[PDB]
Amino acid sequence: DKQHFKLWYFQFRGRAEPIRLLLTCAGVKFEDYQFTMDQWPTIKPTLPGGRVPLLDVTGPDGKLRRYQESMAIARLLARQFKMMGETDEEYYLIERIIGECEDLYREVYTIFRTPQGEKEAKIKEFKENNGPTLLKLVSESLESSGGKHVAGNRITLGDLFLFTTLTHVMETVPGFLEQKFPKLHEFHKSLPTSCSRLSEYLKKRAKTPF
Ligand SMILES: N[C@@H](CCC(=O)N[C@@H](CS)C(=O)NCC(=O)O)C(=O)O
Ligand SMILES: [Br-]
Numbered sequence: 156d157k158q159h160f161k162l163w164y165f166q167f168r169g170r171a172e173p174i175r176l177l178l179t180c181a182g183v184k185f186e187d188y189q190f191t192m193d194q195w196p197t198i199k200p201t202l203p204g205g206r207v208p209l210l211d212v213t214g215p216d217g218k219l220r221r222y223q224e225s226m227a228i229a230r231l232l233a234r235q236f237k238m239m240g241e242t243d244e245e246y247y248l249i250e251r252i253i254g255e256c257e258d259l260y261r262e263v264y265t266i267f268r269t270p271q272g273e274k275e276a277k278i279k280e281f282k283e284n285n286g287p288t289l290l291k292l293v294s295e296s297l298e299s300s301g302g303k304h305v306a307g308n309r310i311t312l313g314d315l316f317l318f319t320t321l322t323h324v325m326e327t328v329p330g331f332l333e334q335k336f337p338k339l340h341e342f343h344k345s346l347p348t349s350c351s352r353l354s355e356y357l358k359k360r361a362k363t364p365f
Protein backbone atom coordinates (compact mmCIF):
# COMPACT_ATOMS: atom_id res chain seq x y z
CA ASP A 156 0.00 0.00 0.00
CA LYS A 157 1.55 3.27 -1.21
CA GLN A 158 -1.90 4.40 0.07
CA HIS A 159 -1.94 7.45 2.40
CA PHE A 160 -4.42 10.23 3.47
CA LYS A 161 -3.30 13.46 4.93
CA LEU A 162 -5.86 16.02 6.11
CA TRP A 163 -4.83 19.65 6.47
CA TYR A 164 -6.60 22.09 8.84
CA PHE A 165 -6.27 24.44 11.75
CA GLN A 166 -6.41 23.16 15.36
CA PHE A 167 -10.14 23.20 15.20
CA ARG A 168 -13.08 20.92 14.47
CA GLY A 169 -15.10 23.37 12.25
CA ARG A 170 -15.37 22.30 8.57
CA ALA A 171 -12.74 19.48 8.86
CA GLU A 172 -14.53 17.37 11.57
CA PRO A 173 -17.05 15.55 9.34
CA ILE A 174 -14.11 14.29 7.24
CA ARG A 175 -12.27 13.11 10.43
CA LEU A 176 -15.36 11.31 11.61
CA LEU A 177 -16.01 9.70 8.26
CA LEU A 178 -12.40 8.36 7.97
CA THR A 179 -12.58 7.18 11.60
CA CYS A 180 -15.86 5.33 11.06
CA ALA A 181 -14.55 3.79 7.83
CA GLY A 182 -11.51 2.54 9.69
CA VAL A 183 -9.12 4.51 7.41
CA LYS A 184 -5.95 5.60 9.06
CA PHE A 185 -4.92 9.12 8.14
CA GLU A 186 -2.43 11.76 9.09
CA ASP A 187 -4.49 14.45 10.88
CA TYR A 188 -2.28 17.50 10.31
CA GLN A 189 -3.58 20.39 12.50
CA PHE A 190 -1.32 23.41 12.24
CA THR A 191 -1.15 26.51 14.47
CA MET A 192 -2.27 30.05 13.50
CA ASP A 193 1.41 31.16 13.52
CA GLN A 194 2.33 28.49 10.96
CA TRP A 195 -0.56 29.28 8.60
CA PRO A 196 0.93 32.25 6.72
CA THR A 197 3.85 30.10 5.49
CA ILE A 198 1.60 27.12 4.62
CA LYS A 199 -1.16 29.14 2.90
CA PRO A 200 0.79 30.22 -0.27
CA THR A 201 1.60 26.54 -1.02
CA LEU A 202 -1.98 25.12 -1.06
CA PRO A 203 -4.36 25.21 -3.98
CA GLY A 204 -6.81 28.05 -3.38
CA GLY A 205 -4.98 29.26 -0.25
CA ARG A 206 -7.66 27.59 2.01
CA VAL A 207 -8.33 24.44 4.08
CA PRO A 208 -9.50 21.72 4.73
CA LEU A 209 -7.47 19.97 2.01
CA LEU A 210 -7.25 16.19 1.82
CA ASP A 211 -4.17 14.75 0.02
CA VAL A 212 -4.80 11.21 -1.12
CA THR A 213 -1.82 9.10 -2.29
CA GLY A 214 -3.43 6.28 -4.18
CA PRO A 215 -2.29 2.70 -4.77
CA ASP A 216 -0.29 3.94 -7.85
CA GLY A 217 1.76 6.14 -5.55
CA LYS A 218 0.21 9.25 -7.14
CA LEU A 219 -1.02 12.27 -5.11
CA ARG A 220 -4.33 13.93 -5.66
CA ARG A 221 -5.23 16.98 -3.57
CA TYR A 222 -8.97 17.55 -2.83
CA GLN A 223 -10.62 20.90 -1.73
CA GLU A 224 -14.04 21.93 -0.21
CA SER A 225 -14.85 20.04 3.01
CA MET A 226 -18.27 18.59 2.22
CA ALA A 227 -17.24 17.76 -1.51
CA ILE A 228 -14.31 15.75 0.05
CA ALA A 229 -16.72 14.19 2.62
CA ARG A 230 -19.34 13.23 -0.02
CA LEU A 231 -16.70 11.70 -2.37
CA LEU A 232 -15.28 9.62 0.56
CA ALA A 233 -18.76 8.79 1.79
CA ARG A 234 -19.79 7.46 -1.61
CA GLN A 235 -16.56 5.34 -1.73
CA PHE A 236 -17.38 3.96 1.73
CA LYS A 237 -21.08 3.30 0.85
CA MET A 238 -22.18 5.95 3.44
CA MET A 239 -24.07 8.22 0.94
CA GLY A 240 -27.22 6.10 0.80
CA GLU A 241 -28.16 2.86 -0.99
CA THR A 242 -31.26 4.14 -2.80
CA ASP A 243 -32.15 7.52 -4.34
CA GLU A 244 -34.55 7.99 -1.41
CA GLU A 245 -31.74 7.49 1.13
CA TYR A 246 -29.53 9.83 -0.84
CA TYR A 247 -32.25 12.52 -0.71
CA LEU A 248 -32.72 12.05 3.10
CA ILE A 249 -28.95 12.50 3.64
CA GLU A 250 -28.91 15.54 1.43
CA ARG A 251 -31.98 17.05 3.14
CA ILE A 252 -30.31 16.82 6.60
CA ILE A 253 -27.02 18.11 5.36
CA GLY A 254 -28.76 21.22 3.76
CA GLU A 255 -30.68 21.92 6.97
CA CYS A 256 -27.52 21.36 9.15
CA GLU A 257 -25.49 23.75 6.81
CA ASP A 258 -27.94 26.46 7.82
CA LEU A 259 -27.73 25.58 11.48
CA TYR A 260 -23.87 25.40 11.33
CA ARG A 261 -23.75 29.00 9.98
CA GLU A 262 -25.94 30.26 12.81
CA VAL A 263 -23.85 28.70 15.56
CA TYR A 264 -20.56 29.65 13.93
CA THR A 265 -21.78 33.26 13.85
CA ILE A 266 -22.42 33.02 17.62
CA PHE A 267 -18.97 31.49 18.20
CA ARG A 268 -17.41 34.41 16.24
CA THR A 269 -19.36 37.06 18.09
CA PRO A 270 -17.37 39.17 20.66
CA GLN A 271 -17.83 38.01 24.27
CA GLY A 272 -19.19 40.76 24.55
CA GLU A 273 -22.31 40.73 22.39
CA LYS A 274 -22.73 36.95 22.25
CA GLU A 275 -25.54 36.80 24.78
CA ALA A 276 -27.84 38.95 22.61
CA LYS A 277 -27.14 36.72 19.53
CA ILE A 278 -27.84 33.58 21.63
CA LYS A 279 -31.16 34.91 22.82
CA GLU A 280 -32.10 35.80 19.20
CA PHE A 281 -31.15 32.27 18.11
CA LYS A 282 -33.25 30.63 20.87
CA GLU A 283 -36.30 32.70 19.95
CA ASN A 284 -35.95 32.70 16.17
CA ASN A 285 -33.84 30.71 13.65
CA GLY A 286 -32.89 28.12 16.35
CA PRO A 287 -36.38 26.69 16.78
CA THR A 288 -37.12 27.00 13.14
CA LEU A 289 -34.01 25.10 12.00
CA LEU A 290 -34.00 22.64 14.85
CA LYS A 291 -37.72 21.81 14.22
CA LEU A 292 -36.84 20.96 10.62
CA VAL A 293 -33.92 18.86 11.65
CA SER A 294 -36.02 17.09 14.33
CA GLU A 295 -38.87 16.38 11.87
CA SER A 296 -36.38 15.04 9.33
CA LEU A 297 -34.78 12.64 11.79
CA GLU A 298 -38.20 11.58 13.18
CA SER A 299 -39.42 10.76 9.67
CA SER A 300 -36.62 8.27 9.32
CA GLY A 301 -37.05 6.63 12.83
CA GLY A 302 -34.97 8.72 15.21
CA LYS A 303 -31.67 6.70 15.14
CA HIS A 304 -30.42 7.27 11.57
CA VAL A 305 -31.02 9.89 8.94
CA ALA A 306 -31.21 7.17 6.25
CA GLY A 307 -31.17 3.38 6.09
CA ASN A 308 -30.37 1.77 9.35
CA ARG A 309 -26.68 2.34 9.41
CA ILE A 310 -24.35 5.30 9.92
CA THR A 311 -24.10 7.64 6.89
CA LEU A 312 -22.51 11.03 6.24
CA GLY A 313 -25.95 12.53 7.04
CA ASP A 314 -25.69 11.17 10.53
CA LEU A 315 -22.13 12.30 11.00
CA PHE A 316 -22.75 15.84 9.78
CA LEU A 317 -25.94 15.98 12.01
CA PHE A 318 -23.82 14.80 14.90
CA THR A 319 -21.09 17.44 14.47
CA THR A 320 -23.63 20.26 13.96
CA LEU A 321 -25.61 19.17 17.17
CA THR A 322 -22.22 19.21 19.05
CA HIS A 323 -21.87 22.85 17.99
CA VAL A 324 -25.41 23.72 19.19
CA MET A 325 -24.72 21.96 22.52
CA GLU A 326 -21.50 23.88 23.05
CA THR A 327 -22.61 27.27 21.86
CA VAL A 328 -26.23 27.45 23.17
CA PRO A 329 -25.84 25.30 26.36
CA GLY A 330 -28.96 23.46 27.56
CA PHE A 331 -31.08 24.49 24.62
CA LEU A 332 -31.01 21.28 22.65
CA GLU A 333 -31.36 19.21 25.81
CA GLN A 334 -34.47 21.09 26.93
CA LYS A 335 -36.23 22.01 23.63
CA PHE A 336 -35.37 19.10 21.21
CA PRO A 337 -34.93 16.06 23.37
CA LYS A 338 -35.05 13.61 20.38
CA LEU A 339 -32.03 15.36 18.78
CA HIS A 340 -30.19 15.22 22.12
CA GLU A 341 -31.06 11.45 22.34
CA PHE A 342 -29.61 11.10 18.78
CA HIS A 343 -26.39 12.86 19.81
CA LYS A 344 -26.10 10.39 22.85
CA SER A 345 -27.00 7.33 20.77
CA LEU A 346 -25.05 7.76 17.58
CA PRO A 347 -21.55 6.83 18.95
CA THR A 348 -23.01 3.54 20.18
CA SER A 349 -23.53 2.86 16.32
CA CYS A 350 -19.76 2.90 15.66
CA SER A 351 -17.35 1.99 18.45
CA ARG A 352 -14.48 3.56 16.47
CA LEU A 353 -16.44 6.83 16.77
CA SER A 354 -16.86 6.56 20.48
CA GLU A 355 -13.18 5.84 21.18
CA TYR A 356 -12.15 8.69 18.85
CA LEU A 357 -14.43 11.26 20.54
CA LYS A 358 -13.10 10.09 23.93
CA LYS A 359 -9.49 10.88 22.91
CA ARG A 360 -9.92 13.86 20.61
CA ALA A 361 -8.19 17.18 21.61
CA LYS A 362 -10.45 19.98 22.86
CA THR A 363 -10.84 22.89 20.58
CA PRO A 364 -12.89 26.04 20.83
CA PHE A 365 -15.13 25.05 17.78
N1 LIG B 1 -16.69 26.05 2.24
C1 LIG B 1 -15.22 25.78 2.58
C2 LIG B 1 -14.85 26.71 3.72
C3 LIG B 1 -13.29 26.61 3.92
C4 LIG B 1 -12.76 27.61 4.94
O1 LIG B 1 -13.65 28.43 5.55
N2 LIG B 1 -11.52 27.68 5.25
C5 LIG B 1 -11.00 28.66 6.27
C6 LIG B 1 -10.73 27.79 7.51
S1 LIG B 1 -10.54 28.68 9.04
C7 LIG B 1 -9.63 29.06 5.88
O2 LIG B 1 -8.90 28.22 5.23
N3 LIG B 1 -9.20 30.23 6.20
C8 LIG B 1 -7.80 30.61 5.93
C9 LIG B 1 -7.62 31.74 5.01
O3 LIG B 1 -8.62 31.97 4.28
O4 LIG B 1 -6.49 32.28 4.98
C10 LIG B 1 -15.08 24.38 3.07
O5 LIG B 1 -16.00 23.83 3.79
O6 LIG B 1 -13.99 23.77 2.79
BR1 LIG C 1 -18.43 16.36 16.95
Ligand SMILES: [Br-]
Nearest residue numbers: 168172319322
Ligand atom coordinates in the same frame (compact mmCIF):
# COMPACT_ATOMS: atom_id res chain seq x y z
BR1 LIG D 1 -17.61 19.07 16.10
Ligand SMILES: [Br-]
Nearest residue numbers: 330331334335
Ligand atom coordinates in the same frame (compact mmCIF):
# COMPACT_ATOMS: atom_id res chain seq x y z
BR1 LIG E 1 -33.47 26.35 27.36
